[PDB]
Design a binder for this molecule. Structure first.
Ligand SMILES: *[C@@H]1O[C@H](CO)[C@@H](O[C@@H]2O[C@H](CO)[C@@H](O)[C@H](O)[C@H]2NC(C)=O)[C@H](O)[C@H]1NC(C)=O
Ligand SMILES: *[C@@H]1O[C@H](CO)[C@@H](O[C@@H]2O[C@H](CO)[C@@H](O)[C@H](O)[C@H]2NC(C)=O)[C@H](O)[C@H]1NC(C)=O
Ligand SMILES: *[C@@H]1O[C@H](CO)[C@@H](O[C@@H]2O[C@H](CO)[C@@H](O)[C@H](O)[C@H]2NC(C)=O)[C@H](O)[C@H]1NC(C)=O
Ligand SMILES: *[C@@H]1O[C@H](CO)[C@@H](O[C@@H]2O[C@H](CO)[C@@H](O)[C@H](O)[C@H]2NC(C)=O)[C@H](O)[C@H]1NC(C)=O
Ligand SMILES: *[C@@H]1O[C@H](CO)[C@@H](O[C@@H]2O[C@H](CO)[C@@H](O)[C@H](O)[C@H]2NC(C)=O)[C@H](O)[C@H]1NC(C)=O
Ligand SMILES: *[C@@H]1O[C@H](CO)[C@@H](O[C@@H]2O[C@H](CO)[C@@H](O)[C@H](O)[C@H]2NC(C)=O)[C@H](O)[C@H]1NC(C)=O
Ligand code: NAG
Ligand code: NAG
Ligand code: NAG
Ligand code: NAG
Ligand code: NAG
Ligand code: NAG
Lengths: 98, 90, 162, 152, 147
């Protein structure tokens, strides 16, 4: 950064006499796209033999489906605590003289 | 797209119109009530009085807001134009 | 095989897309471009009013295109759509819920984001309270759960040394 | 062989999505706290709702996210002044109630700390506590005592 | 084959438990912060210890968790009034020190922010600052000067 020295004394003060109004921009994501993936359509196609070996991995498929459902429910809930802070909507006044 | 291989996308619970409505309602509440609507029923207040209350909150006397109210309003409008212009320019 | 609006070269006779899937093929019987789209698929969903409230349920489709109401979140059957809007309790998606309301049958409607109330704004008007009510708000916050220990030797192996 | 290969890829994608969802939850909690504090009132937390003294913020809708248009209070022009912590008048120590003592060349005034506005030092803006010997950097001056001209 | 299958089963549970433990740690950090602010003192953060103006919270024991019985301050009944940001008396503008100028139609008073308690404008609850040719909105009145 800029190399500057601030003067310090035991009997010296600096107080402002003017001010400027500034606007600061902050970007904060709250959600994203929700995707559900199942083993029946991704891993297998239209063959019975692929599903005949899927009963030994139905447990992991259940775990993945539950994780994806929980992710989707969590993402749906995440919008509620940020935007729905008030349960009353407020119409803007027709008078714009602020 | 990315939906041909069984990777279906869930539509969001809240559509963009409703998020816009929520933001507009919050903006109207914060310009017409300040912080009363965020901690109970909404109480009307003029905007210069809310600005004076915030000035008292940051440690400055409220008379300096009314002494140069036009200057502060022009500065706020210029700042709004500046953020809009810089945003238009990702 | 839909009728496409894009023409191809005179020798190739196939097509692809960004995801590298053959979604277009000429028909050399008459040199006609034809698209390929995968068949309709999805999962069924059940809307339940609840225990000791009702018995009838509704069947919901995620992205399958079609008493019967065509929503933006798929196809909904068994629920009658109504124009009026209340506060919903069972999420569905795409801005519409379902609920059991007056006999009494399940209905689907757009949610209400809140009570439509307009506050009076003036440059010389305020609203100072003259009374207050002491209210208590309950908040639930978990800090821990059960502590478990997992060892392979007893789990992946039984009583065999191999 | 194909299904055993595809299980690993599906599990890796699920773990990556879970990590991304945890990060999204953390960001959403931060955004909710910011909305509850800086938007739904005035937050006294410094350097939390933007650089400078926070006044208010205007939330706006964003695709898969939120933005905040914070309104801050930053000073622009500053000056130099000679200051004293206490002032001695008649063997008594006067301290500023809501201000600070400053002198330009010969006259001492009391101004607020965040803005410059000189005022005459009286008995209403200063309080008496103690004697002159306890304070190290004490400065002689006279107190106006506005009651004296009024009672005459 | 059995060993490989059981190891594959045993890794996903470990990953899920680690994610759940991270979530529990984040929730416990949030709960500890809420405890240390709202219970161990008074928190000035609005809408952090419940809806309304927080006063105190009573922690209670919960199985594998904690709850907080926050005490909040919300208004119930409000009244509309005509207000003025300043008052000129004789070439001098009077500003309220810790109040607001409220009117009921033919008189003026001073009241607090979150409660209604009218009083009489005097030289003790107001301070002078400049003239009344600079304030955009002002209403003529007089002060008491009790001496
Ligand atoms: C405080 O800063 C503002 C911003 O620069 C000053 O306002 C400017 O004043 C000059 C001359 O008075 C004008 O030409 C500009 O157009 C003003 N700018 C704006 C944005 O209004 C103001 O004068 C400064 N005040 C002091 C006491 O220095
Ligand atoms: C403020 O609100 C409280 C709560 O309603 C009021 O207390 C009630 O007053 C009525 C009539 O005085 C009684 O019949 C009730 O039993 C009271 N309830 C409780 C819980 O105490 C109080 O009167 C209100 N104050 C004002 C000035 O309106
Ligand atoms: C320090 O400030 C004081 C007050 O603003 C100045 O005193 C005034 O100076 C002007 C300039 O000649 C006179 O017209 C006034 O009559 C003075 N007021 C009083 C009460 O004496 C003082 O001059 C300033 N000193 C310096 C060095 O700038
Ligand atoms: C501030 O005032 C005090 C008292 O009015 C001064 O103290 C006097 O100092 C002189 C010589 O410096 C002594 O002869 C007196 O006996 C002292 N009187 C008292 C009561 O202490 C002090 O010097 C003044 N300070 C400055 C910087 O002028
Ligand atoms: C507005 O407030 C004033 C001041 O409190 C009220 O004037 C008093 O009203 C009481 C009620 O009858 C009388 O006993 C006093 O004699 C009045 N004092 C004066 C100086 O007039 C006034 O009535 C209020 N007006 C309304 C409409 O509420
Ligand atoms: C408030 O008081 C001021 C001054 O006491 C009034 O201003 C006077 O207005 C009259 C006519 O309206 C003029 O003839 C005087 O020259 C003005 N004097 C000054 C010092 O400006 C003002 O009109 C009063 N406002 C109301 C609403 O009565
Ligand atoms: C659903 O199918 C019908 C008839 O096949 C059609 O009219 C309608 O446009 C389709 N819906 C969409 C969203 O394309
Ligand atoms: C609800 O009312 C609107 C008003 O025009 C009408 O168009 C619509 O058909 C109504 N919906 C039903 C299900 O009757
Ligand atoms: C004026 O302010 C500057 C700030 O850098 C300081 O160094 C200087 O000493 C001040 N002037 C006087 C006369 O003290
Ligand atoms: C400030 O410090 C200098 C240098 O140590 C010293 O000479 C002077 O007396 C001090 N002034 C005060 C008011 O302490
Ligand atoms: C006060 O009066 C105004 C208009 O006269 C009205 O809009 C407002 O709702 C009233 N306030 C209350 C609390 O009744
Ligand atoms: C309030 O606004 C109205 C509408 O512009 C205006 O007629 C009136 O003079 C304003 N009052 C004050 C005190 O600014």
């Amino acid at each position: 950064g800029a190399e500057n020295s601030v003067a310090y004394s035991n009997n010296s003060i600096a107080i402002p006499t003017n001010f400027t109004i500034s606007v600061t921009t902050e970007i904060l994501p709250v959600s994203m796209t929700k995707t559900s993936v199942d083993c029946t359509m991704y891993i297998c196609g239209d063959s019975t033999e692929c599903s005949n070996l899927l009963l030994q991995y139905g447990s992991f498929c259940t775990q993945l489906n539950r994780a994806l459902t929980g992710i989707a429910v969590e993402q749906d809930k995440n919008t509620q605590e940020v935007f729905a802070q008030v349960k009353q909507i407020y119409k803007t006044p027709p008078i714009k003289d602020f | 797209a990315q939906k041909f291989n069984g990777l279906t996308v869930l539509p969001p619970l809240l559509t963009d119109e409703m998020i816009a409505q929520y933001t507009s309602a919050l903006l109207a509440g914060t310009i017409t009530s300040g912080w009363t609507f965020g901690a109970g029923p909404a109480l009307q207040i003029p905007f210069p009085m809310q600005m004076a209350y915030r000035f008292n909150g940051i440690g400055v006397t409220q008379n300096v807001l009314y002494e140069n109210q036009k200057l502060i309003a022009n500065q706020f409008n210029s700042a709004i134009g500046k953020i809009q212009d810089s945003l238009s320019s990702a | 095989l839909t009728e496409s609006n894009k023409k191809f070269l005179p020798f190739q006779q196939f097509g692809r897309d960004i995801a590298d899937t053959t979604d277009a093929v000429r028909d050399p019987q008459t040199l006609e471009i034809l698209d390929i789209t995968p068949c309709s698929f999805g999962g069924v969903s059940v809307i339940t009013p609840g225990t000791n409230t009702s018995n009838q349920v509704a069947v919901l489709y995620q992205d399958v295109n079609c008493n019967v109401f065509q929503t933006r979140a798929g196809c909904l059957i068994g629920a009658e759509h109504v124009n009026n809007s209340y506060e919903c309790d069972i999420p569905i998606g795409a801005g519409i819920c379902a609920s059991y309301q007056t006999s009494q049958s399940i209905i689907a409607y757009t949610m209400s984001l809140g009570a439509e109330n307009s506050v009076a704004y003036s440059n010389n008007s305020i609203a100072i309270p003259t009374n207050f009510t002491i209210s208590v708000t309950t908040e639930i916050l978990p800090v821990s759960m059960t502590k478990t220990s997992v060892d392979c030797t007893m789990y992946i192996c039984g009583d065999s040394t191999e | 062989r194909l299904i055993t290969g595809r299980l690993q890829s599906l599990q890796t994608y699920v773990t990556q999505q879970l990590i991304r969802a945890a990060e999204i939850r953390a960001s959403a909690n931060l955004a909710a706290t910011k909305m509850s504090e800086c938007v739904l009132g005035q937050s006294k937390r410094v350097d939390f709702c933007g650089k400078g003294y926070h006044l208010m913020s205007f939330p706006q809708s964003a695709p898969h996210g939120v933005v905040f248009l914070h309104v801050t209070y930053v000073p622009a022009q500053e000056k130099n002044f000679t200051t004293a912590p206490a002032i001695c008048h008649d063997g008594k120590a006067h301290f500023p109630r809501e201000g600070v003592f400053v002198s330009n060349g010969t006259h001492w005034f009391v101004t607020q700390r965040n803005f410059y506005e000189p005022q005459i030092i009286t008995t209403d803006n200063t309080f008496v506590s103690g004697n002159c010997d306890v304070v190290i950097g004490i400065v002689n001056n006279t107190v106006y005592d506005p009651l004296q001209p009024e009672l005459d």
